[PDB]
Write a structure and sequence with these properties.
The structure is a homotetramer. The first copy, chain A, is an alpha/beta fold. Chain A has a single domain, classed as Aldolase class I (TIM Barrel, Alpha-Beta Barrel). Chain A contains ten helices and 18 strands. In chain A, helix 2 runs parallel beside helix 3 and helix 5 crosses helix 6. The longest helix of chain A is centred in the middle third of the chain and has 19 residues. Chains A and B meet through strand 1, helix 4 and helix 5 of A and strand 2 and strand 18 of B. Strand 18 of chain A pairs parallel with strand 1 of chain C, so a sheet runs across the interface. Chains A, B, C, D: It is an enzyme of class 1 (oxidoreductase).
């Protein structure tokens, strides 16, 4: 067996120590754009998000209403692939053709959308999603450190080359990152076997090494493990380019689930992809996406300024991160 | 006094980090056979289990019905020795002659059975068990780091040579392993004075050193400390060849205890060997052994594939084990 | 990102190990004077407190009655600046002209008072406070590691030179201390992004380095994080010259808030500066300031003698501080 | 300030790892004698206890009935000095002249008794205690790292030389041990500012260094912090010669307090020396001392044999002590 010295930590065991704030660092001046897909040294990503938030590839969160509402604020949704190929493509088409502000829009001024895909029916599913207008694809899996991901990406590259953008994984260490990077993934999702903070720190380190070695920068996504807005700032500071959230978005008016009034409290349904529908429960109703996202990002921008950073890249180089003692928590 | 630097950890403080999964790694392809008794370099163990699970040497778990049901699935039971020599031998005989699938069977196609023995009446007890047809014996003790174990094994070797297989101990460090290894034990039980995970890791390390030094491989058994199926995978990954469980098997229809309906919930009786019958309580009734064991082992096989291993030996060399922070738990 | 090895600790994870107590170390002989403002090698601070306690710059704690009561015991209050410039100046004037024992008094035998100021209206506010008779000023901010603090101090030095004493900050590391030290702050407040004990230890270390480099000693203030009297002794031992407390003083008869009887228990109102009035709650009523402060300081003096120190400076050099294990707490 | 790297641990964070048990190690063969007072290389202590247990210098535990009952089993009590000199001397006299088995008896076959003394009235108190027949004296104090202890011991040595045995302290580190050792203390009490286990380990280390340097062996006493019988074995293994217990003995029929029946449960009164009578509560009634002590020591003897030791000195050299993880607890 191979053992690891330091134990892995969660986002709750960390704190950002303030840096120097200049007079020009005010929330309104903070830029939250981030690259969504890989590019090489000297270039910009073909797709850049206006806000570093993306919605999870789930039935209870990423539907057409969520996709439209999120794209309007600058983020992107990955319509769930846990439905028929015909239904998913229909949903993708619905978002693309909806029209007829930090809106994430394409050349034809249509909202951007991503779609989740699996390692089984990709041959039939990918073409349908591409035809429907999907802007980005992401292989949905809790453990993407497998041949199956390599094969799926390979088929896509053979059939479409670099025309089709495929995100992949859910790896927790540099070894898994490296494997998917070589396989051809446009961005890599982090999160499973390891505390979220350590996973991010380790993968980002490998990602940086890979960039110095190949000149190719692959954006990484922290998927889950975020319990508070502060954790959002921490994930980005540690090197994640954007964050994927499930429960956070399922509370909104736009999530596909039903609102349920349980003795005074209005809730929304929420179940996991691995549920027999994994969990099935409720999240407190929070209203419309816009107002909530705005509240969250305003707090992220302020924290960024406490760290003396006007952009995510600055935050990532300037951030002073410290571990907190168990007793302190 | 002699002090130790790192504190000992339990199985709950560890996590397996995924390795590369090949297309050929599917639960159905995973082989769970393990050696039960020592053998030397270039040979196979005389006895190999089909599944790495063995039932505890207890009154509330290892009876004749349990022995038959477990042997049928590929494991083995150690009939409790906390009864008369005549009763225990009768039970051994009952299992051996029951007949008249991963069944653990002998040359005459009879189910395999083990029996627990103590360091007191072995002179009268061993012969009776051997005559009755016992396939393996195990010295039952919570602290086997004593002269008494050496003496008992010695008597057996003098009287029967290597014809009779005796398991021994319950040691927690390499020093105790080494002592019992030299004494002649065919396999060594781990578990007491030390967190289960650390105990396993340390003994296995000594076991490996001993194998390189003598060419003799002695299988080790993690006895207790397993609270979940995942812990089963962890114990094997850390180097244990098979696991001994008590409470796990006492829930089944086949354990020797009484089913008790306590206001809606059907339970089964469970008491420790050191009880005044140690504890005396209840475990939730789980039904027949077969269905439960199958559920557990299916989850072990999947995890193994997440680690990219098709056999226990591969798991033991490929496993990437990390410690988890206190706060993460 | 920049990471830190050791995690930060709170005051609860520390213990003072006794030193040699001489026959001459009795509570009555302990001297609790401390410097409030910076001075250079070979000189005494222009202002020295008789007791190391100062009240927080809050609406629910630092009013005119509190200022008079605290100054009478040897400490000083910083009248809150979260009110109009006219009101705050009036309050300052009220304390200065109240007259017509470890009393902290000036040349004209008038009680000493401090006032909180912000980085916005200082141009209009500072002159009013100075004219009103304010003895010390302190920039109120949770994160003072910013250009805004430098600018405010700079304006004051340009307009008044070293005639006006300005405290600043709320930094948690040496880098923030250094910045405010160079900016011209007369004393620096510690406390936010980092466990209180570690913050104090790190800043004090920098403060000591700065003193050796420039010959200027800048007194530091531990603001908050003190839950018990013992923590008071710990903060001073670690190097803090004086302590700022909010909740502690809000319990007294002299705090500006209302006494409220809640089913048998008399409480006092307490709300944070960042409340929509931050929290709004109650603290148990404790009576008059005098009797409580006396009880607290008597316990500090005894502990000091257990450490064999008759003054704070001796405590700071003689203290033997140890970390306590998580389980011990 | 002086800081310490490793945090201090309690007895709950440790475990004894078994050693080799020989056939001759049975509880009945274990010898629990320990030296009570200092002696030099090549000699035996003038006073040796038959069991390593001594009762605390408290009003709720060490009275004449307790002293007689404990001496009969081989231990010794230190009659409380928190009473008049006349009362304490009377109690000492009562035990000495009571007569008219591991009994701790003197030359005249009278039970042995100790008495607590303070650093104030020793001039009047010591002579009275000596005249009354006190066999050993102990300076009662929670922090004995002071000039006052040196002075008291000095007076005694000047007046009586080495004829009168005085125990001293309550120190937690080697520095405090060293000070009292040089002052002339016959034995030193450990326990306060530091986790009990670490305190014992550190003082014992200093005690060993002192013995190698001077040839004088000073017995150390672990005072308090023992919550279970296992902790007793741990304290001795770590190097403490004997243990002082308060609550443990206050449960017995022989403690000086009142038995109180509180709705079905018979309790005994228990208050601390620093109580306004410190705490005042109840401990569960346990019956007569004999039966309880016997149960405790039988468990200590067995554990000793699991460590392969027939005497305390063997235990102290053979013990394999490991730290346990926070999560394991």
């Amino acid at each position: 067996a191979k053992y690891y010295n330091e134990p892995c930590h969660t986002f709750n065991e960390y704190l950002l120590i303030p840096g120097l704030s200049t007079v020009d660092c005010i929330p309104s001046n903070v830029n939250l754009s981030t690259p969504l897909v890989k590019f090489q040294k000297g270039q910009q990503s073909e797709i850049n998000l206006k806000i570093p938030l993306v919605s999870a590839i789930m039935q209870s969160v990423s539907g057409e209403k969520m996709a439209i509402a999120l794209a309007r604020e600058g983020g992107i949704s990955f319509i769930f692939g846990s439905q028929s190929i015909e239904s998913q493509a229909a949903m993708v088409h619905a978002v693309k053709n909806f029209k007829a502000h930090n809106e994430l829009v394409d050349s034809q001024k249509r909202y951007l959308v991503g779609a989740g895909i699996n390692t089984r029916d990709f041959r039939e599913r990918v073409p349908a999603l591409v035809e429907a207008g999907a802007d980005v694809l992401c292989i949905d899996s809790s453990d993407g450190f497998s041949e199956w991901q390599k094969i799926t990406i390979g088929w896509i590259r053979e059939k479409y080359g670099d025309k089709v953008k495929v995100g992949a994984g859910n790896i927790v260490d540099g070894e898994g990152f490296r494997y998917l990077a070589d396989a051809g993934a446009d961005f890599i999702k982090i999160g499973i076997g390891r505390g979220q903070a350590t996973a991010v720190i380790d993968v980002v380190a490998e990602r940086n090494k890979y960039f110095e070695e190949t000149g190719i920068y692959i954006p990484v996504c922290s998927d889950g493990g975020i319990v508070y807005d502060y954790h959002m700032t921490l994930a980005l500071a540690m090197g994640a380019d954007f964050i994927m959230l499930g429960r956070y978005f399922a509370r909104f008016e736009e999530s596909p689930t039903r609102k349920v009034t349980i003795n005074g409290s209005v809730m929304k349904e929420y179940w996991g992809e691995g549920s027999s529908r994994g969990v099935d429960s409720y999240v407190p109703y929070a209203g419309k996406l816009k107002d909530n996202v705005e509240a969250s990002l305003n707090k992220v921008k302020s924290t960024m300024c406490n760290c003396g950073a006007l952009t995510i890249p600055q935050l990532q180089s300037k951030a002073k991160i410290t571990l907190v003692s168990s007793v302190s928590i």
